[PDB]
From a paper:
CRL2FEM1B is an oligomeric E3 ubiquitin ligase composed of CUL2, FEM1B, ELOB, ELOC, and RBX1. FEM1B is the substrate recognition protein of the oligomeric CRL2FEM1B E3 ubiquitin ligase that has been implicated in sex determination, apoptosis, colon cancer and Alzheimer’s disease. Cullin-RING E3 ubiquitin ligases (CRLs) are multi-subunit complexes composed of a catalytic Ring-finger protein, a cullin scaffold protein, substrate adapter proteins, and a substrate recognition protein.
To determine whether the ubiquitylation strategy of this asymmetric N8-CRL2FEM1B dimer is applicable to other substrates, we obtained the stable N8-CRL2FEM1B-FNIP1-FLCN complex and its cryo-EM structure. We compared our structure with a previously reported structure of unneddylated CRL2FEM1B and noted that neddylated CRL2FEM1B-FNIP1-FLCN exhibits an additional density in the canonical FEM1B substrate binding site. The map also shows that the FNIP1/FLCN heterodimer forms multiple contacts with CUL2-RBX1 and FEM1B. While the neddylated WHB domain of CUL2 and RBX1 provides a platform for the E2s and fixes one side of the substrate, FEM1B (as a substrate receptor) has three additional major binding sites for the other side of the substrate. In addition to the central part of FNIP1degron (residues 579–585) forming Zn2+-binding motifs with the FEM1B N-terminus as recently reported, FNIP1 (residues 568–574) also interacts with the α-helical region in the FEM1B C-terminus. Furthermore, the N-terminus (residues 1–26) and the C-terminus (residues 536–593) of FEM1B appear to be involved in binding the FNIP1/FLCN complex. These results support the following hypothesis: multiple regions of interactions between N8-CRL2FEM1B and FNIP1/FLCN complex are needed to orient the FNIP1/FLCN complex relative to N8-CRL2FEM1B, and fill in the gap between RBX1 and FEM1B. According to SEC-MALS analysis and MP experiment, N8-CRL2FEM1B-FNIP1-FLCN has a molecular weight of 427.7 kDa and 380 kDa, respectively, which corresponds to a combined calculated molecular weight of monomeric N8-CRL2FEM1B and monomeric FNIP1/FLCN heterodimer (201.4 kDa and 195.8 kDa, respectively). For proteins with large scales like FNIP1/FLCN complex, substrates capture the monomeric state of N8-CRL2FEM1B and fill in the gap between RBX1 and FEM1B.
Author numbering:
A (entry chain H): 568 to 590
B (entry chain A): 1 to 125, 135 to 463
C (entry chain C): 17 to 49, 58 to 112
D (entry chain B): 1 to 17, 22 to 79, 84 to 87, 89 to 97
E (entry chain D): 121 to 495, 509 to 627
Write the structure that this text describes.
């Protein structure tokens, strides 16, 4: 049906609001 | 020989080309050999190895053409009351010159300006071909500075033509066609200049003039005289449109003229409609129909009055005879009414679908009426007619004439609303006549049974 | 019907008008104020472009095969240059 | 039928497209001169009038449009082919 | 900058943590984002690891690179035992660089009991309590998986009563203006309105959305995710129009937030693909115009971003190809959906704005090159691209042109009409038939399908320019300084 935005976070920074791209 | 790029003195070649173009755009005579050499000169200017001189060529051609158009404008404006003739003369000369010099800058038109002109997407969402450049700055500096004067003279002359005097058809047709050719190549809405500058003022002036003329005619003349006059004026308007204006504006001008002519006074025609329908005026029937074919208001009232007149006449004719004891008389009267109104419609109303539908409605109102004491008497009378045609009745009757009578009866039978009662009467009388054995022929009876099938 | 091509060298090539009306430049030069005389094109180049006009009319739109035009190496450069002038 | 010929008169060279006499009539139509006052020469060899054009040696193989064959034309006694410009 | 102690704290092994600590483990040293072992353990909810590190005099009030603390992450992850321990160890209330407190953090994360404990904490003000309860209710209203209508209404009602708890002074919500994208409903200010709208589930979702937008609008927070879920549910409800408006507002907020949206655009185009497929589309081209303008702005900005820092835009480069594929799909939809004159005019305006700047890709593909090759081989897409100002003579990195790729089309008999239409369209408006690509080649020679060969051969118009260019290129004769400059390029073409 629908697939949620992935939003799998950067392990280095734990602040959920911070958005650090992962290579 | 030196087709390879060379160090070309732009000043000298431009000076020679300036003398050439001045004769070319003014339609002065230039020798063919000189033209053939100016082509090579243009090619040399467009390709010079130190720096292509094409941009300088375009800029200097723009300056020369600007000087030319400004001098033409000053000479035209200095003239008074001859603006139209003078403008038409220089428009012919300049159109010929601009079409010729587009050829003379062909290489510069397809190898330098083309690769730097803004694309179609660019314009849709200042460098453009030299051939149309003359027309474009003609727009910029001849009509735009003089559009008011030009439109005033054009409208006054066309108003004079409507008055009765005949102006120069060629000059007027030329100036309006120039109002289009100046934008003849714009790749989008070529008539924008035309629709903006001539159509709107012309449409407004025609509307006002024809409102005045319609009021004057309505005051002056009776309904008939007025209506053939307004038909003649519409025809003369079509003629004037064909003579002067561009073809695409004919429909708009005719529409405005007719809406200002009859749509303004539809109440008068509608009021006269009852009397004119019921008092046969077949010529005015056709004229009313052609007048109100365009305006939507006229047609339905025409239809209603025609249906009312048909119903009144048919009901009167049928009600003249009561208990005639001969149903053939009623059928013959109905057939006569139907044929008369069908031929009237096909003659004056051109067999219009709405009018024949109204005739069918009126005829259905007749026949299928409860005014006689016996309700549903029409199917019974139809049955009696069919039996009298089929039954021997101690009479020798022509089979072909019986077939003709049956074919005529087919129409009135189609007009009657109820056929089940007629079918029951048919079955009963068929059984009766089979028991008594009185009939013209089985095939003749079979034929009308087949006629019932269709 | 017939147009006289004249080279800068001095030759007078005559070909059917419809043959020579396949180049925009020739149409331009024949329009506005016959006997078209190039003061620039040499003889051999004009001969090659003339043979091209007959080649355009026949053996074209031919599904079977269309023969390649033979262009000599020495004349190729100025023939290509004449292509621009004639706007072929 | 598939014949294209270089008819040459000194500097002048016309381009044509099977009878020799009808070729001379075309020469009438172009150069405007009587037919019997002019004699054709295939490589300076006289061709008799009224013969079939194919027999003289011109055919679809050797009269192709991209490489037409040459026929010398002289007004009745001969007045020679003038060659083109030399390739640079 | 990672340390083995941090890895041990991430794993959750108490024995390893204590063994390393007793053997001179460094705690005050953090990672590249300045993250402490206590704080990562708090985010992971290892109560034993957290209580031992606190015992080891490790700083509990540590400030991360964004200002968030261990209490923040423990509240976010719903670890009541951790936040209780940190409060025991006197964890100070710290507002992070996102302008949010651990109470507010737990409020946004729908950790209702963590919110309860942090309200039980002494150092809380009435305004903070009210805002925390309101945010908790709003997040519960639009939560993807922790959704609860009853909890939402209860917490919002308690917050609003606390607003009205004092007769002398009543706190009135600073409600934002109603949004057409949201549905033009206005957030409630009085308990009566909330009691009226608690019956309507959709109205309470609306109220939660407005509360979240008001509370988190000032801060730098990605608030689109609840909007994403709400629009997904509305699309599941066939309410595409409100769904479309919701995703439009989400894209606008993302543009305000300067966040990558390739996935969002991909989804907002995939929804169009599906709703076209169901044929229930009644698609509005004017809406698609806003999408096209937005994606144009996004792609231009991210192209500039790639230009600024090439070393970190490999993923952004991939998103660039993805965005171009999405735009191709949008053009496919525009072909699918009929448009009005003004709607088509705006669509062509946006497409022309894209085209005017040449969007080079890997291997040099332009819009039309992507439109012709297998990505399929859309026809009216290519025709519209050409009509909007795309270049038929555009050169790829390999050197090919538009015609080269399309004539190199597999499966010619199927979609033969598309192939023929594309060839006819592209040869018009300036396709050179014999553009050599890389080493000398002919697009007729490159094509391997007989039908396409016949098509362009019929479409060929010969000229001395092409034939003589071929001869000079084959003979390798020097052409510079002896040829017109415009024709210098033409010689290189062949
Ligand atoms: Zn070519």
């Amino acid at each position: 049906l629908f697939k949620e935005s992935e939003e799998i976070r950067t392990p280095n920074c734990n602040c959920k609001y911070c958005s650090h791209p992962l290579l | 020989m030196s087709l390879k790029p060379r160090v070309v003195d732009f000043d000298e070649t431009w000076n020679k080309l300036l003398t050439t173009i001045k004769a070319v755009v003014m339609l002065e005579y230039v020798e063919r050999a000189t033209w053939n050499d100016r082509f090579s000169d243009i090619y040399a200017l467009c390709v010079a190895y130190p720096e292509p001189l094409g941009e300088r060529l375009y800029t200097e051609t723009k300056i020369f053409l600007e000087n030319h158009v400004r001098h033409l404008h000053k000479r035209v404006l200095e003239s008074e009351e001859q603006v139209l003739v003078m403008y038409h003369r220089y428009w012919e000369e300049y159109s010929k010159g601009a079409d010729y010099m587009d050829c003379l800058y062909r290489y510069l038109n397809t190898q330098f300006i083309k690769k730097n002109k803004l694309t179609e997407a660019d314009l849709q969402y200042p460098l453009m071909e030299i051939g149309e450049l003359a027309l474009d700055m003609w727009r910029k500096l001849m009509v735009e500075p003089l559009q008011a004067i030009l439109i005033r003279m054009l409208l006054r002359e066309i108003k004079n033509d409507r008055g009765g005097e005949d102006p120069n058809q060629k000059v007027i047709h030329g100036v309006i066609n120039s109002f289009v050719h100046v934008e003849q190549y714009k790749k989008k809405f070529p008539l924008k200049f035309y629709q903006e500058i001539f159509e709107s003022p012309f449409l407004t002036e025609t509307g006002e003039y024809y409102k005045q003329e319609a009021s004057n005619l309505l005051q002056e003349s009776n309904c008939s005289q007025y209506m053939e006059k307004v038909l003649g004026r519409l025809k003369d308007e079509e003629i004037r449109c064909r003579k002067y204006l561009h073809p695409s504006s004919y429909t708009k001008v005719i529409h405005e003229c007719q809406q200002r002519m009859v749509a303004d006074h539809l109440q008068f025609l509608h009021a006269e409609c009852h009397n004119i329908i019921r008092q046969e005026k077949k010529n005015d029937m056709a004229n009313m129909y052609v007048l109100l074919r365009a305006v939507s208001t006229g047609l339905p009232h025409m239809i209603q009055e025609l249906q009312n007149h048909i119903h009144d006449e048919g009901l009167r004719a049928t009600s003249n005879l009561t208990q005639e004891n001969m149903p053939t008389l009623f059928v013959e009267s109905v057939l006569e009414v139907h044929g008369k109104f069908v031929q009237l419609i096909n003659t004056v109303l051109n067999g219009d679908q709405h009018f024949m539908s109204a005739l069918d409605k009126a005829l259905t109102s007749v026949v299928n009426y409860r005014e006689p004491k016996s309700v549903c008497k029409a199917p019974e009378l139809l049955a009696k007619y069919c039996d009298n045609l089929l039954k021997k009745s101690a009479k020798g009757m022509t089979e072909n004439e019986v077939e003709d009578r049956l074919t005529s009866f087919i129409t009135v039978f189609k007009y009657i609303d109820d056929k089940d009662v007629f079918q029951k009467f048919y079955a009963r009388m068929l059984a009766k006549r089979l028991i008594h054995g009185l009939s013209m022929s089985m095939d003749s009876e079979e034929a009308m049974i087949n006629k019932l099938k269709q | 019907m017939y147009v006289k091509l004249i080279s800068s060298d001095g030759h007078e090539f005559i070909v059917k008008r419809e043959h020579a009306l396949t180049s925009g430049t020739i149409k331009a030069m024949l329009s506005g104020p016959n006997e078209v005389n190039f003061r620039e094109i040499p003889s051999h180049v004009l001969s090659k472009v003339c043979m091209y006009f007959t080649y355009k009319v026949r053996y074209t739109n031919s599904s079977t095969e269309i023969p390649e035009f033979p262009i000599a190496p020495e004349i190729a450069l100025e023939l290509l240059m004449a292509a621009n002038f004639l706007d072929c | 039928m598939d014949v294209f010929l270089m008819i040459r008169r000194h500097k002048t060279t016309i381009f044509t497209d099977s009878t020799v006499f009808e070729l001379k009539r075309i020469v009438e139509g172009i150069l405007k001169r009587p037919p019997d006052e002019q004699r054709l020469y295939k490589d300076d060899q006289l061709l008799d009038d009224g013969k079939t054009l194919g027999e003289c040696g011109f055919t679809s193989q050797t009269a192709r449009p991209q490489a037409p064959a040459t026929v010398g034309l002289a007004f009745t006694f001969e007045a020679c082919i003038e060659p083109f410009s030399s390739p640079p | 900058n990672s340390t083995p102690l941090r890895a041990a704290c991430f794993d959750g092994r108490l024995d390893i943590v204590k063994y390393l600590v007793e053997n001179n483990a460094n705690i005050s040293i953090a990672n590249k984002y300045d993250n402490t072992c206590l704080m990562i353990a708090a985010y992971k909810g290892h109560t034993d690891v957290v209580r031992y590190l606190l015992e080891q005099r490790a700083d509990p009030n540590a400030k991360a690179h964004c200002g968030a603390t261990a209490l923040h992450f423990a509240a976010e992850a719903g670890h009541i035992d951790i936040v209780k321990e940190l409060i025991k160890w006197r964890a100070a209330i710290v507002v992070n660089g996102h302008g949010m407190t651990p109470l507010k953090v737990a409020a946004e994360s729908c950790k209702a009991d963590v919110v309860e404990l942090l309200l039980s904490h002494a150092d809380c003000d009435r305004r903070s309590r009210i805002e925390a309860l309101e945010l908790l209710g709003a997040s519960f209203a639009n939560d993807r998986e922790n959704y609860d209508i009853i909890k939402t209404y209860h917490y919002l009602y308690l917050a609003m009563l606390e607003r009205f708890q004092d007769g002398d002074n009543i706190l009135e919500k600073e409600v934002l203006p109603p949004i057409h994208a949201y549905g033009n409903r206005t957030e409630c200010r009085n308990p009566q309105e909330l009691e009226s709208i608690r019956q309507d589930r959709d109205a309470l979702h609306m109220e939660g959305l407005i509360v979240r937008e008001r509370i988190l609008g000032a801060d730098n927070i990605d608030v689109s995710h609840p909007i994403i879920y709400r629009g997904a549910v509305y699309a599941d409800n066939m309410e595409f129009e409100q769904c479309i408006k919701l995703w439009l507002h989400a894209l606008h907020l993302r543009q305000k937030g300067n966040r990558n949206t390739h996935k969002d655009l991909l989804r907002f185009a995939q929804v169009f693909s599906q709703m076209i497929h169901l044929n229930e589309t009644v698609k509005a081209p004017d809406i698609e115009c806003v999408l096209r303008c937005s994606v144009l702005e996004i792609e231009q900005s991210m192209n500039r971003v790639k230009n600024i820092s090439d070393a970190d835009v490999h993923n952004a480069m991939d998103n660039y190809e993805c965005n171009l594929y999405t735009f191709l799909y949008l053009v496919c939809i525009s072909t699918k959906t009929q448009c009005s004159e003004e709607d088509q005019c705006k669509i062509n305006k946006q497409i022309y704005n894209l085209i005017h700047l040449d969007p080079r890709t890997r291997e040099g593909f332009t819009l039309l090159h992507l439109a012709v090759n297998s990505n399929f081989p859309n026809a009216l897409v290519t025709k519209l691209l050409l009509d909007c100002g795309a270049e038929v003579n555009a050169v790829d990195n390999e050197g090919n042109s538009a015609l080269h790729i399309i004539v190199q089309y597999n499966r010619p008999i199927s979609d033969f009409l598309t192939l023929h239409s594309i060839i006819i369209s592209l040869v018009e408006a300036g396709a050179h038939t014999d553009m050599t690509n890389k080493q000398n080649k002919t697009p007729l020679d490159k094509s391997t399908t007989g039908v396409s060969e016949i098509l362009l051969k019929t479409q060929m118009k010969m000229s001395l320019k092409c034939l003589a260019a071929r001869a000079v290129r084959a003979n390798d004769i020097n052409y510079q300084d002896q040829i017109p400059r415009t024709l210098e390029e033409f010689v290189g073409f062949h």
